[PDB]
Amino acid sequence: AAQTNAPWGLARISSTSPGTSTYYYDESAGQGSCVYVIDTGIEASHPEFEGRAQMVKTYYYSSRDGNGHGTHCAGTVGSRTYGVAKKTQLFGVKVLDDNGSGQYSTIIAGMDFVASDKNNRNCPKGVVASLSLGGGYSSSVNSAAARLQSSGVMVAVAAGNNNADARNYSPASEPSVCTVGASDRYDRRSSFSNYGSVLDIFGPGTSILSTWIGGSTRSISGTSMATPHVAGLAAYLMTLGKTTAASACRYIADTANKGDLSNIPFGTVNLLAYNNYQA
Residues that bind Ca ion (CB under 5 A): 72-73, 175, 200, 225
* 65 labeled part of a ligand binding site: no
- Cβ proximity to Ca ion: between 175 and 214 the closer is 175
269: DSSP letter: -
Name the active-site residue from 15, 28, 224, 229.
Answer: 224
Distance CA 87, CA 235 (A): 10
Provide, rounded to whole angstroms, the least separation between the CB of residue 72 and Ca ion: 3
The sign of the torsion formed by the CA atoms of 209, 36, 45, 81 equals positive
Provide, rounded to whole angstroms, the least separation between the CB of residue 206 and Ca ion: 12
- Cβ proximity to Ca ion: between 26 and 174 the closer is 174
- Residue 47 has phi, psi (to 5 degrees) of -55, -25
Cβ neighbors of 103 (< 8 A, separation 6 or more) are: none
Could you give the 3-state DSSP secondary structure of residue 122? coil
60: DSSP letter: S
Provide, rounded to whole angstroms, the least separation between the CB of residue 198 and Ca ion: 6
- Cβ proximity to Ca ion: between 175 and 241 the closer is 175
Check if 224 is active-site: yes
Distance of CA 123 to the CA centre of its chain: 17
ω into 124 cis (within 30 of 0): no
Name the active-site residue from 14, 15, 46, 69.
Answer: 69
* 7 labeled part of a ligand binding site: no
Provide, rounded to whole angstroms, the least separation between the CB of residue 199 and Ca ion: 8
The sign of the torsion formed by the CA atoms of 139, 140, 144, 147 equals positive
How, if at all, do strands 23-24 and 126-131 pair? unpaired
* 187 labeled part of a ligand binding site: no
* 177 labeled part of a ligand binding site: yes
- Cβ proximity to Ca ion: between 9 and 126 the closer is 9
* 16 labeled part of a ligand binding site: yes
DSSP β-bridge partners for residue 203: 182
- Cβ proximity to Ca ion: between 65 and 200 the closer is 200
Spatial CA neighbour of 116 closest among 77, 75, 147, 142: 147
Spatial CA neighbour of 37 closest among 190, 229, 206, 174: 229
Distance CA 11, CA 23 (A): 4
- Residue 226 has phi, psi (to 5 degrees) of -75, -35
Provide, rounded to whole angstroms, the least separation between the CB of residue 224 and Ca ion: 6
Name the active-site residue from 39, 65, 117, 187.
Answer: 39
Annotated binding site: 16, 175, 177, 200, 260
Catalytic residue numbers, as ranges = 39, 69, 224
Annotated binding site for Ca(2+): 16, 175, 177, 200, 260
